[PDB]
């Protein structure tokens, strides 16, 4: 004899949320700027909306004035769209979130969480891709997937910055032809920088070993 004692809670529940939100919009509605010029506040103000399940970027709508939290979001998008291009050659069409974060984004004070979403934003333009080497997120400007191999080389670079012909056999049991071979394409494709100044063996580097910050 139990069926309605809950279908009832629903209707008001809807409210509680329909509430929490028209609520959420105000806690925001107030901090018109504590939100517009402050990462930390950004993040926190969202890790809520997400729990409830409300796209923040949207709250920022019920009243004209919140529409600049988004501008910034959009704005940062373009910066990414651009930092990516302006770099295609230094790197290879692949980029460390770090760099993105702790390099190109001090000029406007945005922060990991920020950047991060913006990048998601873009998934709409359907153009970049994210991949991680050892749990470090990279964004990929170019068309090609790094390889199932290339990763590794890239992966095995994280240590001191430079996979090598030996470092590979050694630490990976990677043969030795199926190595230079695989290592150089990584240079024709311009993902890692070559380096003859350091031994009989050639050293291959990670643009990123650089921004270790």
């Amino acid at each position: 004899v139990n069926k309605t004692i809950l279908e009832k809670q629903s209707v008001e529940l809807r409210d509680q949320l329909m509430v929490f939100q028209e609520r959420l919009v105000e806690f925001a509605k107030k901090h018109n700027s504590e939100l517009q010029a402050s990462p930390e506040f950004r993040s926190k103000f969202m890790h809520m909306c997400s729990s409830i399940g409300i796209d923040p970027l949207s709250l920022f709508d019920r009243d004209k004035h919140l529409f600049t939290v988004n501008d910034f979001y959009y704005e940062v998008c373009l910066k990414v769209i651009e930092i990516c291009r302006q770099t295609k050659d230094m790197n290879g069409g692949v980029i460390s979130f770090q760099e993105l974060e702790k390099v190109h984004f001090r000029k406007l004070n945005v922060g990991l969480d920020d950047l991060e979403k913006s990048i998601d934003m873009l998934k709409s333009l359907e153009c970049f891709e994210i991949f991680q080497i050892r749990g470090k997120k990279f964004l990929r400007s170019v068309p090609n997937e790094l390889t199932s191999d290339q990763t590794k080389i890239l992966e095995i670079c994280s240590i001191l910055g430079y996979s090598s012909i030996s470092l590979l056999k050694a630490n990976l049991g990677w043969e030795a032809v199926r190595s230079k071979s695989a290592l150089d394409e990584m240079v024709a494709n311009g993902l890692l920088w070559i380096d003859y100044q350091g031994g009989a063996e050639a050293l291959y580097w990670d643009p990123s070993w650089i921004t270790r910050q």
């Binding site: 333009l125 068309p143 150089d184």
Partner: protein
Amino acid sequence: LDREKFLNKELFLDEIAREIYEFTLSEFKDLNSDTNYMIITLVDLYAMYNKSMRIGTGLISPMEMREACERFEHLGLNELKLVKVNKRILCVTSEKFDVVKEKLVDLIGDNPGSDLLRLTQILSSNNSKSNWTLGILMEVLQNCVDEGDLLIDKQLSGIYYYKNSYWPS
């Protein structure tokens, strides 16, 4: 001449769609003689559209751009279309995809042994009717290659391009 302050949403788009369609057309057909085209990667016809014709008018998000751009057809805007090509190329163009790939191949063909950079110069620093902009160039180059429409000559230097006139499909 109005800020993102309209009321019934799917207008601002409809409209915003319109604005873009022009920003785009406003960037090529001008020429006396008509034979030109503009294939363009979405992402770029995006920092272009904004940074340009829309820093004060009300800057917009990607989803919007897309949403917008996806409208042309419906709005009787029939001079450009958005289209996924293969399943990787995303662009709004002015011709059938192929017929643009074609024009590349063919030209690469004429100047074979080409570097990106060169492929660029031919396509850009010689003003003459090109809307080729890096990325979409870049993107298409990779089709041919995969589709096998182009023969690669991968050197440590970089990748040199040629016309797959020998191992046809």
